[PDB]
Each structure stands twice: as structure tokens, then as C-alpha cells.
Amino acid sequence: GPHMATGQDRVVALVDMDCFFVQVEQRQNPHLRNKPCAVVQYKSWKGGGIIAVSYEARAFGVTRSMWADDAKKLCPDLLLAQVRESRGKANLTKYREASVEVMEIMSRFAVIERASIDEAYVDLTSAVQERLQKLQGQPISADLLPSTYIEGLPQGQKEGMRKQGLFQWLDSLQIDNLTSPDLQLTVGAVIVEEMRAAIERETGFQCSAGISHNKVLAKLACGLNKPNRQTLVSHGSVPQLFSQMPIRKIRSLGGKLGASVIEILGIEYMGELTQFTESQLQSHFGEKNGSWLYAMCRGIEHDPVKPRQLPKTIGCSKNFPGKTALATREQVQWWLLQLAQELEERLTKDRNDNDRVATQLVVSIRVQGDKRLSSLRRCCALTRYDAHKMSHDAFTVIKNCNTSGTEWSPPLTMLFLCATKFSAS
Template identity: 45%
Template sequence: MPVARPEPSDARVIALVDMDCFYVQVEQRRQPQLRGLPTAVVQYNSWKGGGLIAISYEARKYGVNRSMRGDEAKKLCPEIQLVQVPVARGKADLNLYRNAGSEVVSILARKGRCERASIDEVYLDLTDAAEAMLFENPPEKLEAIDEETLNSHILGLDEEVGKQKGKLAREWLCRSNATQQDKLLACGAIIVAELRMQVLRETEFTCSAGIAHNKLLAKLASSMNKPAQQTVVPSSAVKGMLDPLPIKKMKQLGGKLGSSLQSDLGISTVGDLLKFTEEKLQEHYGTNTGTWLWNIARGISGDEVEGRLLPKSHGCGKNFAGPQALKTLASVESWLKDLCEELSERLQSDLDQNNRVAHSLTLHAAVYKTNDADQLKKFPSKSCPLRYGASKIQEDALKLFNSGLREFLDSQRAEIQGTSKTAWVVTHLSVSASKILAKPSGTHSILRFFHSQDSSSSSKEQTYVGIDENSIQFSPSGGENQVAADEVEAKKDPMINRVDSNPIQGDQREVSYHKGTNSILRLFHNLDPSCPSQEQTYNEISQNSIPSLPSGSENRMAADQVEATKETLISHVKSYLARGEMQKETTHKGSGPILRFFQAQRLPCTSSDNAVPSTSGAEHEQELDRVGTYEESRKEKVEINDDLSSLHHEEHRPERWRLNPEEIDTSVIDELPPEIQHEIRGWLQPLKRAKTATRGSSIADYFSPAKKGPKSSNS
């Protein structure tokens, strides 16, 4: 992927911060009595003790690893504490960990550019900060360097056994005869150590880090000394580090490409890779990959830190392994409902907290053929424009599934014709939302768009509504719907694009959150109705739209005008805006800003009228109609279509939200937008912070000697 680029002459300072067994730490913060104990996080506890997805370092000593089930782990380590991943709607709910990850990001983003690489990994570009430090306050002038920095591992330094800890590191960090590059890395080490201390103080999480001149090396270094330590890679140490390294350890080479390198070219270490010319590698793997391989063998990577604090997509899915495979259409529909509800909630949160709107919905499924030898399970993924509101998403996802199923069955028809009894089961379902863009803060661009569309907009509207109603929104492979689908893209997208064409967009927005002095004030300002620039416009434009809760606007959207007018199209946009407006209105009810803010978080009311039991897959398995034989499948299509039409008339229950200030407790903070979590934490938990801060000046001894963490030691 990364195009060849020579190392910039001005060296960058890049860090990768990696949370130590993150899910375990999150659970240990919730239950401090677990600190220091061998602990693992498992999901789906019902079968063989659940699958392990995170293992504490105490437990790793017993040989417990991620490929195990809870039961196996218990055999190796009888005292192991198994904590279950929260379950919602019958599936794993990772929100707790996502939000904890956001806490960390919001702290790390204080210095330099910050890229959220995964739920527990963050890249930092500290070049500017390091240069500034080198200029204003270089390490060689520093009389004291903090303990955490001194604990850094410097690759290439001989760590003699007898030598006092930190002695060599101190010398290296403060050398006045060091190269500019090394001095910058030294500054990076100081900054990262400080950031890691802040993370620990404010979140109680430990992390490890690598500091190097690019992402590739920083990533490698971060895992060399864990947990709770940091590792610096001076340029002089790169060759020594890489040459003996098995290629499988390199990022991107852990899978098939790495295997192919090994089996086809006999390359097992990075050093082996060095012997191949760029051209040779390109012959085998294409120009891009060839060049990329040649570069990484030398520790060269021009990959930039992206400056993105938020995920680019949201998805939720579930596997239905073995006996759990879905056999009935009803169960597919039911699970899709659950998945779409979760997705919708997360999209709504993203809209509320980050002002972002997703524009594409994708459904993926895996189907298992129970009867034939080649149990093919290629089910095409399908996507369509995303409409907000749980029931809309659900409706569209079902249509996508229907479309995929039809295509899948058609593709199989030829092979099947002989065999009469071919049954199918669904082994995986997932829905995801992507193409997430910043919602414009004002509506000028939208209004301008409609003013400029006066003459032609009505015809476009007709197309749009028609599409909405007939559910023709599949991609070209959908066949007969292609023309209509293309028209949707042609007519609808201009509108969407205009909405999104506001200069303040995605990444820039995120960065701007951190540029000012106080992100909380800024956030409240954004929600403040008295803020004239946007709110006035919102109120104005939403006057005519029905102020129902999030899913309410669907009613208008679904109105069955055949001859559509510009007014209708405009009302769509009004509804769209009204959704945003409603979120804001709920925030005005409270008295103080914090209260208002918490209320805006909308704890979901347990919808008692939820028709679908969401606890176990078994309950979805009532044998109604089988997805069974191919012959039956033709009938299914009809059934699916029937289902769709019935869905269409489904009552629209407005979602209700309970706003209960009494329920505000510290765990709620996890739900807050990343930008302000740590600030709120600071307000609510001043005592705890003071306590943890006095514990020690180094991260390594934070939890280690005492079996108990600072939190439980006072209870």
C-alpha cells in the first residue's frame, strides 16, 4: 500500500502506544479486586467456558493464550479469573472497550498528530513536539530526567547485567554528541513517557510504546518490552533489529503474503529479504507490493500518521457456529433486527457526539451448504445508501439480504440442478455503516442547493421517492434494478454531497476539537441554542417537520406521494435536519451544562414491547419455514417479498429515552465523547486522581509489588 518514498531528510518522531491486554485492564478498572490476579476476558461463556480474547500478563505466565477456551485456561491456571464480555441483544457488546479506548486517545491527542489505529493502539507523530523540546529544553541540558523515561529500553545499547538500571539510558538520552536524529528520539522518549504517565493517572490503564522514526519501526518496538514499558529505536539499531527478525513478525506479513515469501522465495527472516532486488520482488508481487517489501526490509516506511481520532466505519455482526447456524428466515430476520438496532444506536451516538453522518449500509452474510461436498459459502455482500432510524436500517438490511440470497441461489443453480435436497444455513450476519462524513454545522449549503435546483428538482424527487418505496437500491449486480439504482446515485448523491461539502470536515473537525483551550466549552457552545449561526437556521427549517424522535422522520419519508414535488424533497431534508435538532433540544432541558450533557446521552429505555427475546439464539430457532432446499428457495423469494411488504406496514414505534439524572455515576463517563471524557473524569474524581498520583513516579512499579492496585488498597 504505502508508495515508495525515501526517508525524509528531516527525521520524524513517531510513536505507537499499545494498551496492555486492554480488555482485561478495562475489566480490572471496573473490578479492582481483580488487579494483579491472573485474569482473562471471555465471550460466550456458555460453550467450554467461552473464547478468550484478552489475557492478563499474570495469566500468560501459566501458558494461557488467545486460542484457548475458558475451560482450557482453567486447567492451566485454576485460579484464573474469567470475566465475560457484556452481552446486549444476544451478542457481544464492545462499547465498554471502545469508549475506554477513546479515553486514551483523548489524552494522547494532546501532543502532536494522533491516529487511532485500533481499539487499543494509537500512533503519534511527535515530530513537532520533539523539535520544539530539542530547541527549548534539550535533554542534554536537563538536570533531571524522570524515572519513566530512564526506564526506556534503547535498542542497541548493551544492557550489561551489573550496570545500574537507567544508567546507560541516561547517558544515551543526554549525549551531547548524539546525532540530531537520536536527540529527537530522546525527546520523543521523554514526551511518550510523560504521556503514558498521564494515561495511567487519568485512566488507570498501563500501556507500552515504541518510539522510532517511522510507524513500522515504532510498531515493532512497542511489542518488544511489555507490559508497561517503552522502547526506542535509534537508526543505528535498525539493521540489528530487523535482520534476524522472522518476516512473519512484520506487520502485513503475518498471513498469506508472509507464507508465500517463505515458501516461494525461501525467505524466513527480514535479512533474507534483503538479498532480493526490488525488481525481483516486483516480479513476484507486483510493483507496489514489491517496492514496499524492498523498503520494509530496510526499515523504510513513509507511511504517515493520519490524524484521525474516530473510526471510519461502524459494524456489528455475529457468527452462528455449528448448531447455532440459522435455519429459518424468521431467525435471520430477527437477528438482523438486533444487529441493526445496535448499529443504529451507535450511528446515533456518533451523530450526537461527533456530528457525523454515515452514508452507506453494507450487509454481509455467510451461508453454509449442508449437503454437498464442497460446502461453498460465498455469499455476496451488498450495500445501499444508508437511511437513519433503526427500522429503516433494518428494512434495508433485509432487502440487501434478500438480494444477496437471490444472487447466491442463482449462482448455485447450475451446480444444484441434479441434487434435489440441498439445504442452506446462515453462519454469519453483519451490517456495517461506512462513508462517514462530518455533518455541516450550518445549513447554508443545503438551502443554496435547493434554490439552485428549482427547475429540475421535482423530477429528481420523483426518482428518489420511487426508489425509497420500491426498495430498488441494489448495486449493478442486482440486475433489473440497475438503471433505477444508478439514478439514485445520480440524483440523490448530489444532494448528499452538497450537504457534506462544508469546508469543516471529518479530520479537520476532530483536530480542531483539540486546538482550542477547552473542548467542553466548545462542545457546549455547539449545542447551545443561542448560538445563532446554526441553531436559528435549524429551528427555522424544522418548523414544518414533525418533531418526533429519531425514527419519527421515517413517516414523512415514507409518505406515498407518487407525484413528488420539490416540497417533498425539501421536507426530507427538514426531517433529516430535525433529527439533529431533536438531539439538541433534549440537551436543553437540564439546568446546568453537565446535567444537560448527561441527559443528551439518552440512556435507552428498556423497550418492554420488544417482540424479540434477545438473550439466546435458540429462541430464534422456532422452526417456521426452512431455508432449505433449492426448490423451496423459489418459494422463499416470495416469502421474503411478503415479509418485506409486511415490514413496510410495520408500525413505527418512536423510540423512547429515559433521562434520569439520578443514574449518573462514574461509569457513565465511558459513554462520553472522547474529547471530553478525561476532563469530566478530572472533575468527578479529584480524590482518586490525587491518590494514584502519589503512588510512584514510574509506571513499571505501579501495580507490581503490591498485589492490589491503588484503588483497592484504600478499601
């Protein structure tokens, strides 16, 4: 009882820009706004691969990783924006810069962990504490939560349902207790309304957010009510929420580990995990995964929000699928040079912006017919931001993969250069 720590010490938020690349194109081109539209890469093969879909378009069944010519079968009025092409490859600079706009606004409110180009985690514990002192016992009005849902409420139309649930939550709230986790979450949610308002004011971008006591719950909460809405998942809401939550829906259980949890334990939903002892879970899935699962199925997770706003690596990738696979030496060299030239641009810009240099170059390749997604991964020293030297070094490091007797065999289906191991500058 009094000694089971309940994982209620922190207020963590997960903010996620709704269909981010689509929003970036729709800010730049108003004719796309409030319309079924998607963002594609390339156009020749089946109209290009779709990588982002507005919610209007999603209502027609358009999804990511779907050819544009097929999405047009589901949605004949679909509008398409194309990713920039530079040096023969997709170039995602417009979106990295829009992402930095968003991240810099979020960093004004709290410390953020950049989880990907369009989502960040937020540690709000200090901010909530400050705000609770600033209220001086004043009760939190529903007007401060115009877009917040309270998961599991109401108990016992859609905006109506939302406001009913918020009303029940706020009526139950104990505002004189500056240490009640639920109050803390509620103030976190007010601050997240403010963050999202500032993001939309200052960028035009809308997002969704989850507010809970840890990153996994925040992330799960954020997906509950999209787009342009935020969701508070309280500790108390976890048993019901998890009682029908497929295991695959939890961050990091969507793959082979989730599938083996399901198969080995003979369960479907996250809450069923609570019936196993910690030792049992460790015995099946290893000591780290076991401990993490034992706590996570109880709503408890300790992974900190890392203070890291900038990416840890800067990478350049291109697949060469099917017949476009590279089969000559000139081909591999020219594409390694294209890759190294984009990477050098991004790296010099990073050095000027963020006062740091990369020190290690990683070269990954895939060879045709190889089952694995990386056929080889070798690193070398990165000592100057020079595209020609970088491409020469990558070739030097992969050349003993050619089995020909000017040809390249097996032909290459992927090149990949990554600058890593940053040091202050």
C-alpha cells in the same frame, strides 16, 4: 552515500494499551487487579472464548482465542470477566468508551491515528522540534526515561540491564545537534513517557509504546518490552535487530505475503531481504509491495500517520456457528433487527458526539459450509437511523440468497451490518 535518504525525517510512536479489555474490567472490579485474569465472550460453549489475558495469566500459558474451560486447565486460579451481552449478542461499548478516554488524552500531545480500539500511532516530529528548542541545548537526563529501553543496548538483573543500556545511549548522545535523528528519537521517548504517565494518571490504564522513525518500526519496537514499558528503536539498531527477526513479525507480513516472501526467496529473517534489488522484489511481489519491502528491510517506510481519531466505520457482527446457524426467515429477521438496533444506538451516539452521519449500509452474510468468511457483501443506501428500516433493507438486499421453497437454506453462520461513508453533519 550523501543521497540515500535514510527515513530519519519523522518521530513516530505506537502506543498500545496492555491487555486492554482486562485492564478495563480490573479498573471496574478491584478484586481482579494484579491477578491471573482474562476476558471472555459468551460462557455456554466451553466456558466462553477468551479475547484478552493479563500478563500474570499469560505466564501460565493462557492465550487469546482459547476456550475458558481449557485456560482453567492451565490456570485453575484464573479469574474471568465477561463481555456485556445485549439483544443476544456481545456488546463492546464499555471498551469503546474506555478507548475514547485514552485517545482523547493522547490527542493532547500530538496528532494520533487510531489504529484499533486500543492502539494509536503518534506523529511526534513537531512536538520534538518544539521540545528541542525548549531545552536550549540542555542534555537529557536518564530520570526523564524511567521506563524506556534502548534496543540493542547494552553492548560490549533486568532493570539493571535497562539502566545500563539507557546509560550507554545517553552517554553517546550529541545534544548540541538539534538535527541528529537519534536525539530526536530520544526527545520523542521523553514525550512518550509523559503521554503514558498522563494516560495512567487520568485513566488508570497502563500501556507500552514503541518510538522510532516510522510506523512499522514503532509498532515492532512496542512489542519488544511489554508490559508497562517503552522501547526506542533507532535507525542504527535496524541491521542487528532485523538480522534475526522472522519475517512474520513485521506488520503485514504475518500472513500469505510473508509466507510467499519466505518460500520464493528462501529466507527466514527480515535483514536477508536487503540482498535483493528493488526490481527483484517488485518482480516477485508486485510493484507496491516490492518497493515497500526494499525500503522496509532497510528500516525505511513512508506511510504517514493519518490524522484520524475516530473509526471510519461502525459495525455489528454475530457468528452463528455449528448448529446455531439460522435456518428460518423469522430467525434471520429477528437477528437482523437485533443487529440494526445496536447499530442505531451506536450511530445516533456517534452523530451527537462527532457531527457526522453515515450514508451507506453494508450487509455481509456467511452461509454454512461456505469456505469464505464473507459469503456475500452488498450495500444499500442508509438514509435514516432507524433500526427497523435498516433491518428491512438488509433483508431486502440478502433475501435472494434463500434457496428454499419460510425456511432459509443454506443456513446462515454470520450476519454483519456496517455503516460506512460518513459525511459531516
